[PDB]
Amino acid sequence: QGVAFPISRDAFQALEKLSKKQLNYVQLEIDIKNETIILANTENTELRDLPKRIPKDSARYHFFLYKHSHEGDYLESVVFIYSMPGYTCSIRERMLYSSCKSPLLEIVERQLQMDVIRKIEIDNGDELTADFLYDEVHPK
Amino acid sequence: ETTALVCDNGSGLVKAGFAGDDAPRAVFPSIVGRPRHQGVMVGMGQKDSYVGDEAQSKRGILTLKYPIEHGIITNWDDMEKIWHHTFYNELRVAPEEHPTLLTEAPLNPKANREKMTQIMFETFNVPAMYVAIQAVLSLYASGRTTGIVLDSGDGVTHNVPIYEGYALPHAIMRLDLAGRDLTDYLMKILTERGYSFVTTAEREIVRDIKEKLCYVALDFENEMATAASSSSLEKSYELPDGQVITIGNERFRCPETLFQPSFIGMESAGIHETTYNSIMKCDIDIRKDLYANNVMSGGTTMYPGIADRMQKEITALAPSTMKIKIIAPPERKYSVWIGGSILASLSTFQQMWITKQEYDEAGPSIVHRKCF
Numbered sequence A: 001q002g003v004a005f006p007i008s009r010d011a012f013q014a015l016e017k018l019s020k021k022q023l024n025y026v027q028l029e030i031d032i033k034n035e036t037i038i039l040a041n042t043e044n045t046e047l048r049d050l051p052k053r054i055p056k057d058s059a060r061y062h063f064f065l066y067k068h069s070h071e072g073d074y075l076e077s078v079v080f081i082y083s084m085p086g087y088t089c090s091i092r093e094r095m096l097y098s099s100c101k102s103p104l105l106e107i108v109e110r111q112l113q114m115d116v117i118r119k120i121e122i123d124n125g126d127e128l129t130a131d132f133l134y135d136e137v138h139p140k
Numbered sequence B: 001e002t003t004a005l006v007c008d009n010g011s012g013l014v015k016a017g018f019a020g021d022d023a024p025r026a027v028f029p030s031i032v033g034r035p036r037h038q039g040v041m042v043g044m045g046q047k048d049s050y051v052g053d054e055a056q057s058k059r060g061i062l063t064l065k066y067p068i069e070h071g072i073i074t075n076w077d078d079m080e081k082i083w084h085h086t087f088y089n090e091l092r093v094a095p096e097e098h099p100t101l102l103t104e105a106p107l108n109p110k111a112n113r114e115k116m117t118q119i120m121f122e123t124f125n126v127p128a129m130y131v132a133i134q135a136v137l138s139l140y141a142s143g144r145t146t147g148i149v150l151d152s153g154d155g156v157t158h159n160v161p162i163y164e165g166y167a168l169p170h171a172i173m174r175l176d177l178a179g180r181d182l183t184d185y186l187m188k189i190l191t192e193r194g195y196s197f198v199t200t201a202e203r204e205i206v207r208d209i210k211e212k213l214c215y216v217a218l219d220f221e222n223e224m225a226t227a228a229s230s231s232s233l234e235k236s237y238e239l240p241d242g243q244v245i246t247i248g249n250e251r252f253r254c255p256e257t258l259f260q261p262s263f264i265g266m267e268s269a270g271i272h273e274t275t276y277n278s279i280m281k282c283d284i285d286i287r288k289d290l291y292a293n294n295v296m297s298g299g300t301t302m303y304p305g306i307a308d309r310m311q312k313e314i315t316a317l318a319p320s321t322m323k324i325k326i327i328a329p330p331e332r333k334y335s336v337w338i339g340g341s342i343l344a345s346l347s348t349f350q351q352m353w354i355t356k357q358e359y360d361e362a363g364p365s366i367v368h369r370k371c372f
């Protein structure tokens, strides 16, 4: 596991800044032809506008600073999301997003000490409600 | 241009081809044949063996064998012949010039993965090769790394939970019933309807019937009743000479066997129950996402209405407040092969191959380390 697409310079800086909580949201995309991971968006995003960030017509990777209280503690925990809207994506788009995931997570972890608390795979991010996200990170 | 080969070896059929093509170029039976008795056969040629289509045509002269039983390779002498035949006869390539991706079944012994790589390097002299789990390739192709794949091919049906690219071997269910069993039951009950199919020329004809007319009922007894008391759902089938026979409740009774294996005697849970059990053997936690991501692969999941039926059955077995989805891609018949082609065609895949140097230095395995 699995296939490592070079993460662009720009992208790597966004992720780094997320690791230091200077950014709260970093969205990446794969350039299929170039076999490359490139920076799509770093628009400052609160939980309540996260759904709007998730494209409904192509697949994306997301790293999102999830600010929330857990039984006494305010936690600002990094969540990873792989979003995939369905057959609007080509097989090749689906295989690459699926296949290029683990190595991307490996770099962020070993080099940026990102502390990815949870990874989530979703269809559209209507799903990404307040209670959904709390249940993912803090199950029962 | 050196070009990578991709091979998906199944119990019934070999799908083979070039990485980057979007469909497998060679699809032919995983059948090896050898002279029926000892002395001089007629007309055995100047040859000790046949593979694939030729082996079918000369069935009367040969003893036919499947080297892959239930996804696993059990006859290595015969498996070598299928590979040889795939390279030289089907693909027209010289194996030594080409990186080869190969696929493997659930619950495949580690020793088997090793002899597989061993043979590729020692006997076929591939410069590089690599091995991928079928179920994982299909999951990944559907655009997800976690879910439960229901792979149903020609001789085996597997339920395989996968977490984050990794199959959970302890939760993998195996069910020895698939396409070849379904063609034969269609043959049986079609002959009971008063026609006659015994007979290997006829088995072919029934395979085409099965593959073009069959469907899975949403509600089986509804449909049996809807057929007994009306000629509503009767498709006519053109025999290849000109006769025309009429096919009725067989049309859905045949793949019903998947959910109701008692139909062919066998005491065993159906595909819905096995996929429930598989799930149930996992984390209480992970279960949520298994249910939400049931992916289907393999030719025996190609029946119309199979997706919906699963939806019905799974729901009926699940906690009432469970989010259940089945994903049944249009490409699912060769999704395993398509996924390898996509992978083996990427420049960034050049440094993922196991090489001859790596294998020499050594040896076979290399495979468990470098591929997963």
Ligand SMILES: Nc1ncnc2c1ncn2[C@@H]1O[C@H](COP(=O)(O)OP(=O)(O)OP(=O)(O)O)[C@@H](O)[C@H]1O
Pocket: B009, B010, B011, B012, B013, B014, B070, B071, B152, B153, B154, B155, B156, B157, B178, B179, B180, B207, B210, B211, B212, B297, B298, B299, B300, B301, B302, B303, B333
């Ligand atoms: N449209 C269809 N409807 C029903 N069955 C089909 C269809 N197309 C192919 N099949 C059946 O699927 C089987 C072949 O599928 P597949 O190639 O996935 O199996 P395999 O890889 O050879 O076997 P296994 O995975 O069990 O080892 C055959 O029995 C074939 O008749």
Ligand SMILES: [Ca+2]
Pocket: B009, B010, B011, B134, B153, B154, B298
């Ligand atoms: Ca198969």
